[PDB]
Design a binder for this molecule. Structure first.
Ligand SMILES: O=C(O)c1[nH]c(Br)cc(=O)c1O
Ligand SMILES: [Mn+2]
Ligand SMILES: [Mn+2]
Length: 179
């Protein structure tokens, strides 16, 4: 276990339940794919944090089931004209009027940024990558959030990494490229 216990102790029950739903839909067991379990939990929490740091600025798309997520995306596109994205993004920014793809990587932020940008192939989806070392990379170096919110996200990620390290789980996670 170990990784399972750490996930249950460091993430709130709602996030853990959402991640378990994601993995049960993928056909993957969270007791076997422990690293993917933790990665999904971390990504969900970063998305929720990003959103909470907003007159209601961000619409959360991640964390919903596919049907609801695409319903939300379609409503946004129909009421703003913003082009519908090819792949499901993570948030929508009502202030900048643009979708946001959030990335959390155990590798260098620029490697994962290139990977995500090559993947999404949509010039209009904004991309924000965070690492577990306090580094970030965003489209056009536009980081959207203010310094304090980004710092809180960075601190949470670093703290997750250090919690894993104290439990001897960081090495496997970092090499597990489940992201
Ligand atoms: O939306 C998704 O399904 C998704 N999948 C991976 Br893999 C990494 C992400 O950041 C993300 O948002
Ligand atoms: Mn997503
Ligand atoms: Mn994402």
């Amino acid at each position: 276990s170990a990784m399972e216990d750490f996930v249950r102790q460091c993430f709130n029950p709602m996030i853990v339940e959402l991640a378990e739903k994601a993995m049960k839909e993928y056909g993957e067991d969270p007791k076997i794919e422990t690293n993917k379990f933790a990665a999904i939990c971390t990504h969900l929490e970063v998305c929720f944090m990003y959103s909470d740091f907003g007159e209601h600025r961000f619409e959360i798309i991640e964390g919903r089931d596919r049907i609801m997520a695409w319903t939300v995306v379609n409503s946004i596109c129909n009421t703003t004209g913003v082009e519908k994205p090819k792949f499901l993004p993570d948030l929508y920014d009502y202030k900048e009027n643009r979708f946001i793809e959030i990335g959390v990587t155990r590798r260098e932020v620029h490697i994962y940024y290139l990977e995500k940008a090559n993947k999404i192939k949509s010039e209009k989806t904004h991309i924000h990558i965070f690492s577990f070392t306090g580094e970030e990379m965003a489209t056009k170096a536009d980081y959207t959030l203010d310094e304090e919110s980004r710092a809180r996200i960075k601190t949470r990620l670093f703290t997750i990494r250090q919690e894993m390290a104290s439990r001897s789980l960081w090495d496997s996670f970092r090499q597990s490229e489940r992201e």
